[PDB]
From a paper:
There were two tetramers for the binary complex and one tetramer for the quaternary complex in the asymmetric unit. The average root-mean-square deviation (RMSD) values between the monomers in the asymmetric unit were 0.5 and 0.3 Å for two tetramers of the binary complex and one tetramer of the quaternary complex, respectively. In contrast, in the binary complex, the active-site loops were partially disordered with an open conformation for the two tetramers in the asymmetric units, except for two of eight monomers in which the loop was well ordered owing to crystal packing. A structural comparison between our quaternary and binary complexes revealed that the active-site loop, referred to as the substrate-specificity loop, exhibited closed and open conformations during the binding and release of substrates, respectively. The superimposition of our two structures clearly indicated structural changes corresponding to AXKO-0046 inhibition. Significant structural differences were observed around the active-site loop, with a maximum RMSD of approximately 7 Å for the main-chain atoms. Other marked structural deviations, except for the active site, were observed in the two helices near the active site (residues Trp228–Lys246 and residues Asp311–Asp330), with a maximum RMSD of approximately 2 Å for backbone atoms.
Lactate dehydrogenase (LDH) catalyses the conversion of pyruvate to lactate and NADH to NAD+; it has two isoforms, LDHA and LDHB. LDHA is a promising target for cancer therapy, whereas LDHB is necessary for basal autophagy and cancer cell proliferation in oxidative and glycolytic cancer cells. To investigate the binding site, we solved the two crystal structures of LDHB, that is, the binary complex with the cofactor NADH and the quaternary complex with NADH using the substrate analogue oxamate and the inhibitor AXKO-0046 at 1.80 and 1.55 Å resolution, respectively. As a result, we identified a small-molecule LDHB selective inhibitor AXKO-0046, an indole derivative.
Author numbering:
A (entry chain A), B (entry chain B), C (entry chain D), D (entry chain C): 2 to 334
The structure:
């Protein structure tokens, strides 16, 4: 006597189903929604859950995505301040907290976002004990460490976005120089996300041609190709976008969807994301820095061993000391 | 001597090139940027141009998109306040609009958007004489008429977003009720975008099964399936999203990229978009209302003829009267 | 130290993994390989298993797909005459058997397939007890019933290709007549695959406009648009392709990949596939005929009830009698 | 009143539109149809034209693809023995092959193809004066020269498949040793397609880590990883597939669709295809060999300069001498 009962005859008994490829995005700000629309555009989720503390914005974002359902392949979009909505996620993307603000210190940003992660991370693993967490919130290397400690997950299931976007920006800047697609330019930005990153000059190449062999002054102060400036522009181009539009979100959203594609399609592609690097390159503390990592359906299963130069190792160790000096004073992790 | 000279040997001489599939988005607000990221995600553009009056925000958006180039298939992303940047676009998406002032009247807000269009639309056609224009800006049926008048373009090359999003919402809400994908739920919202739209109950079907034959009280006040309430929610769900997050953008972005895909791939798919309906359903003035329209590489080349019911025709005629009453009082078109 | 040992440092311990979306194709003939290339081009499989009795052809097909891996997103392609290679498949596509030289179907021909399927189907469920089976082998409605009986699976997990391809050909022919994309042409070919199929004229529509309402003579000899001839061409166009190239494969490959996409993305999209229709439209025997069915991650979970005409119901009953006449004399089920 | 006249009201007058991204495949054999299905699956063509000398098989392949139209985004699929069908193609794929007689000199086999190509190639350029020609037919380096000479086209519009598939198989074999996606493996097979190709060991890398740096014996007769055997497997794996299934087609079809994607999307990606290499690496004759080439909408616009070792340059020069030894004796070019 219901329309649905006149129209639809069951062949299977209706039952509780669990999604096969559920993704949660925590924080529905600029970055969380760029992540959400990128995941939906690539059809990466059979179920998308959104969480924030702003219950009205959260409901509005959920409804706006639902209204686009005809154009997508995600049959369930749900949102709630309550983490019960996130249950049985395969991947949880954490974009929550506050951006850096002009006039505020790096310590200040650590205190604001560690406060947020202390509430969020235990809730995530309560409902999705088997998930992979992708940490995007800044400062990303500290917050990846904080996530690993609070989550109790194994290292291979806690991934910092780290230098993934730095590398994508570097390959774009190379591409601009040469007039070719960034996918045909190869080069790795590793270590700490942003100011103190390492450009691995020996690896920079097109079609396997070492650009450091063609220009041995690459990365020195006596270089007519000014590669040191290109490395600086990886950092400075982001600050410029932040000054101009207030934040960055589109490139980070696409880069997060690209990580998720590698994992849910079980591809074992190599990405410069952040992993726990104690015992690598002489690092003696528990810190997360970016190295070329293999990603697949298990998470971050392997790292590439590189022949890093003494100056490259020296920067990784100084980064590890800077991170550890902040981390050793964090309480209740 | 330059790295590029050492690395790259020309086979062809460098030459002045014209993009084959250039798209321009006018307005880099939350709607324009949802259009841009949806266009880029579907690889619909070999060149994307952005235009706005906010020079810094425009540059920041352009740079953020460029930083994501590794993940895309759009070799040229450009932005400027000067419409020369839009030259040789195949498709121009207009999302430009002003912010309401505190307590500003409703016909005043219309006149201010019309004054924006009096500058923008002649510039668009100056630089892209061969383009198709998609109008998204509100009020969308009026601003589609304005664009048509100011552009001097034939009616097959000016397309209002109209009820494209209203029909996507309808198919979502009917899909939610039935537990099926919205692509398997068929139903048309026509006429005026928003409050005065027409739900064509007689066409609402699943697998060619008329839901109105199953439930003959569909659309009436004596209906246990409350279909009139579903039509109400098509209108009200949009106001609710605006109340909750301040605006809508994700669904409109996806719907616009769906229209562009029909045109650039020359598919002749049918979409409920706004066209110039003088001479249809007893309408005797130049107004734009939504009907099922065939879209391909020439633009909007055909409309589907419906036998509409008396109440459905009455509402289209009342809508045409409302739009013409506003239009006949606009100057310098 | 192997290359792998110098180059790749483990983060996670090495472990076997169960694929999340493994597909098996049984039979690497023209149809089997069209299904495989369509499955791989849509990235629907994280593991693809191929089975055949021709060991050299099987290994050759496996290697040729593997050589294309750079261009795909399927990290494991395996092939063996032994069904152990098929373990833990979500979906198994059965294309094995004999194909028509021109076209027929009779008790003895089906007993030869039952002889083939009697070995294949128990092997499939032995290694993938939780799979969904898509039957493509002709005669497809009888062999869907045979697969169901031999498998012991519930009816929601055994799906016949049925009239999925017939309906696609119908929508192509409608599109050629009207000059619109087939996705904008709606029409359902139901019942038996091939000669005795039913064209549900009542459901044929563009944009919800009933073409039978514009032409109430549609499907009779009272008809100047000769829609009866379009239905004839759905049947004959297949025989014509077999005449001209020896077999058909591309359209069936694409249509099978479309069914798989609905199920692995859990979409609940509606397709005209073959299901067990005992107790529908007065059918009294266990036979498989095509109706509009909902497909998702559970398999075929529902059927759409339609307001079918007396002559359409007579045809389903006669088809049922025809299939039951054959099945009742099959042995070793 | 035709059905179409009652249903569809023109907004623009009906007009003949020149397709924007038309592709022609010459030869509808195993390789041609692999190219066609990959082109269609990636939505690269608004019009696909097929040409062959076998009228029935050509028409059958055309009809089978048309019957899959619902599942594609190519609104026009055409086929004819007459090259008029190919008019206004952006790209033409040549897979047309005569088979070598079992007591036949290599000069005779190529002259047999020249007698065929002497009709095909002029006919292609007559109907598509602006086209890019991709030559797939074996022997591929000689036939690319023949195509260039007969076409009158500049070097940048004639592309030999060359070592494109050799490099894809090399990356697959690297990837199988490491358990990673072939896209994360980098290595270049250059020069002559097949037995005499050059593996550029100095460019073989993962994440910019030189495998020759890790193993300086890479490619020598004192090599514990036996990379010489991996290079042999690149050649031999193809002969193995021919022995096992009669031919290769799937990997070649995916590789051609990837080249087409670079050019139609104007990406300037680098591919190891065959270009006219007179005046490079001391080569003094008009021959085609594979180098890393930049592909975009103009065709092959640029080549990457490598620092090749003396033994690599000597092999390029030898290959050039072998090709020129045959070409100098060809008549009617
Ligand atoms: N790793 C990288 O490469 C990049 C990192 N980011 C970082 O991503 C983060 C997000 O940036 P935006 O989205 O622009 O910020 P935003 O201010 O637009 O969004 C942050 C959201 O987090 C929510 N939030 C705050 N506390 C929360 C809690 N306890 N639980 C749940 N949600 C909570 C807020 O309500 C807000 O909606 C920042 O830390 C930013 O620095 C941004 C760009 C790139
Ligand atoms: N038709 C539909 O279904 C929908 C229509 N819309 C409409 O889309 C429009 C855009 O909305 P939002 O992005 O949220 O607004 P917004 O105010 O955030 O962005 C509009 C942009 O237009 C720019 N603009 C103003 N004057 C300009 C000029 N002369 N040239 C170029 N750009 C100029 C502004 O600087 C601003 O960046 C509005 O009219 C909105 O109502 C909104 C959603 C759905
Ligand atoms: N349902 C539909 O809409 C369509 C159905 N078909 C049917 O698909 C089937 C396959 O046709 P084609 O691929 O053209 O035939 P084919 O002869 O090219 O391939 C059949 C393959 O099955 C293999 N095979 C036979 N017995 C086997 C066994 N016991 N175990 C494993 N493999 C076995 C053969 O060795 C061969 O490789 C036929 O029954 C054909 O009529 C084809 C077109 C459309
Ligand atoms: N470069 C590479 O890496 C690869 C190249 N190939 C080559 O591709 C070619 C095609 O191989 P298959 O498709 O397996 O052969 P096939 O024999 O299956 O198909 C060849 C087709 O060309 C047609 N043809 C012959 N002469 C013609 C003419 N004058 N005009 C038009 N069509 C004509 C034939 O009728 C036939 O349909 C061969 O030369 C083969 O060696 C094969 C795979 C890899």
């Amino acid at each position: 006597a219901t329309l649905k009962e006149k129209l639809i005859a069951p062949v299977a008994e209706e039952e509780a189903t669990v999604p096969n490829n559920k993704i949660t995005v925590v924080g529905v700000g600029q970055v969380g929604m760029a992540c959400a629309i990128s995941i939906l555009g690539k059809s990466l989720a059979d179920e998308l859950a959104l969480v924030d503390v702003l219950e009205d914005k959260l409901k509005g974002e959920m409804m706006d995505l639902q209204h686009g359902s005809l154009f997508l392949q995600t049959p369930k979009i749900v949102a709630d301040k309550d983490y019960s909505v996130t249950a049985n996620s395969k991947i949880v993307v954490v974009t929550a907290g506050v951006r850096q603000q002009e006039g505020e210190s790096r310590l200040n940003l650590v205190q604001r976002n560690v406060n947020v992660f202390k509430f969020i991370i235990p809730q995530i693993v309560k409902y999705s004990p088997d998930c992979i967490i992708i940490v995007v919130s800044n400062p990303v290397d500290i917050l990846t460490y904080v996530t690993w400690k609070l989550s109790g997950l194994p290292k291979h299931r806690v991934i910092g976005s780290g230098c993934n976007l730095d590398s994508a920006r570097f390959r774009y800047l190379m591409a601009e120089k040469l007039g070719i697609h960034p996918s045909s330019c190869h080069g790795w930005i590793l270590g700490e996300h942003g100011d103190s990153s390492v450009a691995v000059w020996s690896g920079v190449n097109v079609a396997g041609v070492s650009l450091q062999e063609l220009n041995p002054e690459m990365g020195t102060d006596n270089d007519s190709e000014n590669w040191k400036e290109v490395h600086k522009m990886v950092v400075e181009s982001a600050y410029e976008v932040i000054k101009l539009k207030g934040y960055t979100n589109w490139a980070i959203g696409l880069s997060v969807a690209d990580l998720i594609e590698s994992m849910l399609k079980n591809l074992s592609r190599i990405h410069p994301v952040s992993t726990m690097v104690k015992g690598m390159y002489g690092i003696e503390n528990e810190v997360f820095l970016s190295l070329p990592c293999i990603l697949n359906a298990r998470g971050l299963t392997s790292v590439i061993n590189q022949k890093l130069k003494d100056d490259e190792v020296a920067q990784l160790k100084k980064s590890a000391d800077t991170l550890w000096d902040i981390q050793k004073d964090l309480k209740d992790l």
